């Protein structure tokens, strides 16, 4: 649902 930050330069939308 909400954003998920993995690391520097990696995300999920």
């Amino acid at each position, epitope marked *: 649902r*909400k*954003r*998920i*930050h*993995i*690391g*520097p*330069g*990696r*995300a*999920f939308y």
Partner: antibody
Amino acid sequence: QVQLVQSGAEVKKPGASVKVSCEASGYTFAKFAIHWVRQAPRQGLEWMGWINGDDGKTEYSQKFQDRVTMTRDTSASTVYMELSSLRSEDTALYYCARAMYPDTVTGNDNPAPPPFEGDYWGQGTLVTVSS
Amino acid sequence: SYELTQPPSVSVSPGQTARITCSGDALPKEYAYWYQQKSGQAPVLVIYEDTRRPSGIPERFSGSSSGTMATLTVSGAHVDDEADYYCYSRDTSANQWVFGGGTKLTVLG
């Protein structure tokens, strides 16, 4: 079996530098980034930055961007964190913590929400800045 | 900018509900995470992704998030729930993680 073991405590002089090491074991070192958060005595937690295990790309806090540099050893499965221009106010307990989410997106895969992979911290390293 | 703010202290009687509310403008689109830190111990994550518990945390700990507010709730507080509670979320503008100032939970009586 996931473990993050940090280097031992040490005294350092004002103006010198520290480099704490954070050695990982029990998981694929490449698929996880590693945080660094510190806590001065009787103060709150403050995030310093994190760095991925594979590419070594770093991202620093606005408070520490001048003095902190973070690196990692691809072969040794260890991330490092260095703070120069040490003052007495940098006397703190320095933790490393594995990121909550592994890297599922870089691989060839149509959307898959990366799962929460647990709360895992190092034991911390006390850095005393004194003469 | 951006900041997460939580009260410094919250007092609760044994058996009733304690509520720690973290306020942040990015909470509508950013998850909130809650850490428990007892005296002389490392932080322990008790709530991940606004409302989920890491496996091993008692279910009397619960979390929610609505608008600019994220709340950690301890239903029927034990004396053993006295600790410092930190909220933790993403600062997208500055591209950094941020902690709340922390809230000391005092169990009265």
